[PDB]
Automatic annotation (TrEMBL), chain A:
Record-annotated Ig-like domain positions: 7-96
Main location: secreted
Cellular component terms per the entry's GO annotation: extracellular region; MHC class I protein complex
Subcellular location: Secreted
Lineage: Eukaryota, Metazoa, Chordata, Craniata, Vertebrata
The species this protein was found in: Anas platyrhynchos (Mallard)
Keywords: Immunity, Immunoglobulin domain, MHC I, Secreted, Signal
Disulfide pairings: 27-82
GO biological process: antigen processing and presentation of peptide antigen via MHC class I; response to metal ion
Protein name: Beta-2-microglobulin
Family to which the UniProt record says this protein belongs: Belongs to the beta-2-microglobulin family.
UniProtKB/TrEMBL annotation, chain C:
GO BP, one annotated term: immune response
Superkingdom classification of source: Eukaryota
UniProt topology in membrane: Single-pass type I membrane protein
One Gene Ontology term, aspect cellular component: extracellular space
The keyword Disulfide bond is assigned to this record: yes
Keywords in alphabetical order: Disulfide bond, Glycoprotein, Immunity, Membrane, MHC I, Signal, Transmembrane, Transmembrane helix
Domain Ig-like: 183-270
UniProt-recorded name of the protein: MHC class I antigen
Keyword Membrane recorded: yes
Gene from which this protein is expressed: Du6MHC I
Compartment annotation: Membrane
Amino acid sequence: GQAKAAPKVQVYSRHPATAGTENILNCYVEGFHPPKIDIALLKNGEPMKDVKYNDMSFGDDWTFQRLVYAPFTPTKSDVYTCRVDHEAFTEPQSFRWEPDF
Amino acid sequence: CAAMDDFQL
Amino acid sequence: EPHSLRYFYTAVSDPSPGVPQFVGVGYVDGEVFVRYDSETQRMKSRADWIAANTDQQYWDTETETLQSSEQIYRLNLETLWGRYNQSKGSHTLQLMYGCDLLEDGSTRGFHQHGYEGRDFIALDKDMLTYTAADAAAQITKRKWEKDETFLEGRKFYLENTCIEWLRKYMSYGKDVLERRERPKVRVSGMEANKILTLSCRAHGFYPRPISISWLKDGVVQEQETQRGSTVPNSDGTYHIWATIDVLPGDRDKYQCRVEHASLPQPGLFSW
């Protein structure tokens, strides 16, 4: 029958973060079938500017991968999450960036 | 160079 | 290092945001260099080095080839609908094919279909027979293994055309493909009431292969290390983290070791 697979998500910045220094926030969603998905980047729960979406691709087990990214400047209290909605999820799921200052 | 699809499933 | 030229086609019955009806993407050594979709109906350059080294006839033939493939996968989806009793659902048909140049000079080719996220039919290593996963796929197999010239054509494309265009592409893109970019590494940690978990993050390394491991007094802690998967950054570089839980008082004994082509020797990093 239909082989469905739930996403696996990693949230990370392009460079090691320093409070107040511009960076790029990355969310990498992989391992999911079917290809239909929604991926959002969130700043304190709200969508972000200048979010870009790389090419959806797939690997050997047929499951799909997609990179999402945006410019941001991390601070000490700003919470950045990646929200993934996929039909293999019971409900849309959130993954918080860990600043790692 | 992509391959030319000389047969369908 | 196994060099590769690969194409990935994706055909769906029900497009959605981010998913056009048909997408074909080409990779050299793991990196995108061409893309086609049913939105544009155009083979477009996805890397400077391929654009710099082709003429408009290249993009015109490549566009022609993929328009034909797009039409054919529209037919293939209907064909597979007549092979199973599912009704009006989301159908996903996937193709991967291409060739590997291994280290010793030997070569391998690939031509495998997936239907509904499962295997459907795959070209075997001899490149003259296929493995069908189910009875629906066996109809394709009997149909195809009957056609001597079609079998030879595909074997020749993967053994000859694919491999030599891979070498051409490797020439075209040497300075990008064989460049080195150093990981910027940071070790972070959070001591909790009784356990300090150390976190080693490597930002922006190229090429993709990397080894990141955790050391106690220079001795690997492989069973205690937890690795994320290597994942890409926007500019074609890569990212990995590795964590390990440690006793707080033993903090000073722990360093993260990164093995990577861009580093003259394996690098060591500390909290």
